[PDB]
Ligand binder design. Structure first.
Ligand SMILES: Nc1ncnc2c1ncn2[C@@H]1O[C@H](COP(=O)(O)OP(=O)(O)O)[C@@H](O)[C@H]1O
Length: 399
């Protein structure tokens, strides 16, 4: 079964590659590769290689010496004076680094994330190569759509390489949720490009609860995640962003610990009222008001004949959970949500779905999808109706 997971991963990557070919590159990846190899000097090949195998140089956990060297580079050669103690043996792995447990000079236990020394050069060389390739596509692939791709690559790369960015996001959240009854965000103790230090917290990882959690653990951490999702933009005008179980844990006192803030998305105006409004109107099947609301919001394409059945299908995954007091998010239900209402053999229609959502709607809907999927993995019972009434603008009965 370990095989099947990787097979699914491979299938997903294949699909997204095909998506890139059809919606972006305007040619197959192999053909594009031939063009790129012709259109990019071989002289740029060997540096790109040499930039990439220092990262290959110490693949397993870094020996103490190299750890201390990174610390030298980021906090100075006297970095030890800032600690009470430091464990040379890493306790966890990060995407491009490793995490150590230590004790800060004030006596607080801390997690210290140390970036691999060869990560910066490698990732930036990779970025350069992909920039060149985008150039090749833009100039030589007829009908290619590479709009905004370079910017996305640069932004992603910088978010991975400069720890201070995520550190700043985390500071915002740590300030907002200090002494909160249900959420715990560790404070940032120190931040540098390649080293970031924060208060140590540990509980039961959400992944562990997904695998072997009790019903009560599942329900609780699920309900907490759901709450955070709508509370954060209301509280500090920010959304925690696309969720992953690795970001969260259940603490002994029943609070949810949150440790990853690399996907924080800006929402200055809070959650758009159009969303909650749309869900309420859809529950009531008030299509007369629902369709103009969705069109104005940009949730459906303007000036199109739309199918009410398709609208119902479109909003089903949002409507069904709030039709009950406590909804049981399950994989079974989520699977039912993928079963299309309209067979293409019955009727050939173009979808009413907006494939170019406004940003203000696109971001929260994406995060909500990720969260919902996680709730289904958790098999969590969640009072999403009440949470929506209290936290989501426009959802409660407007009387
Ligand atoms: N504040 C913290 N307290 C305890 N452990 C932490 C803390 N921050 C990170 N970790 C450990 O580090 C691991 C990865 O950290 P993470 O923030 O996900 O790094 P990255 O996002 O770069 O992968 C986590 O699985 C967790 O066990």
């Amino acid at each position: 079964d370990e095989v099947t997971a990787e097979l699914m991963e491979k299938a997903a990557n294949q699909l997204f590659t095909v998506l890139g070919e059809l919606k972006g590159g305007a040619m197959k990846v192999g053909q594009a590769l031939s063009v790129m190899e012709a259109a990019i000097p071989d002289e740029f090949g060997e540096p790109y290689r040499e930039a990439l195998t220092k990262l290959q140089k110490d693949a397993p956990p870094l020996p103490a010496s190299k750890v201390h060297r990174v610390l030298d580079g980021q906090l100075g050669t006297k970095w030890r004076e800032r600690f009470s103690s430091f464990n040379d043996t890493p306790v966890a792995s990060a995407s491009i680094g490793q995490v150590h447990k230590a004790i800060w000079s004030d006596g607080r236990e801390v997690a210290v994330k140390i970036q691999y020394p060869g990560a910066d050069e490698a990732l930036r060389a990779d970025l350069k190569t992909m920039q060149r390739m985008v150039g090749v596509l833009k100039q030589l692939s007829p009908g290619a759509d590479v709009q905004g791709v370079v910017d996305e690559l640069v932004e992603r790369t910088e978010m991975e390489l400069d720890y201070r960015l995520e550190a700043a996001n985390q500071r915002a959240f740590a300030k907002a949720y200090h002494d909160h009854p249900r959420f715990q965000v560790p404070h940032v103790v120190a931040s540098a490009p390649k080293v970031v230090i924060q208060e140590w917290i540990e509980g039961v990882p959400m992944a562990e609860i997904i695998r072997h959690g009790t019903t009560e653990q599942r329900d609780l951490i699920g309900t907490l995640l759901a709450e955070l999702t709508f509370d954060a933009p209301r509280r500090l005008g920010l959304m925690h962003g696309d969720a992953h179980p690795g970001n969260f844990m259940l603490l002994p006192d029943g609070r949810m610990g949150i440790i990853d803030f690399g996907a924080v998305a800006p929402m200055p105006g809070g959650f758009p009222i159009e969303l909650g409004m749309t869900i309420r109107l859809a529950r009531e099947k008030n299509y007369d008001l629902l369709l103009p609301t969705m069109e104005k919001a940009g949730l459906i394409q303007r000036g199109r004949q739309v199918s009410v059945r398709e609208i119902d299908e479109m909003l089903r995954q949002y409507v069904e959970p709030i039709q009950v007091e406590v909804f049981h998010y399950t994989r079974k239900w989520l699977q039912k949500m993928t079963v299309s209402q309209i067979d293409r053999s019955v009727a050939q229609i173009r979808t009413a779905r907006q494939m170019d959502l406004p940003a203000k709607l696109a971001i929260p809907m994406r995060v909500i999808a990720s969260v919902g999927a996680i709730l289904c993995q958790l098999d969590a019972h969640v009072p999403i109706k009440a949470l929506s009434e209290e936290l989501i603008p426009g959802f409660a009965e407007p009387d």
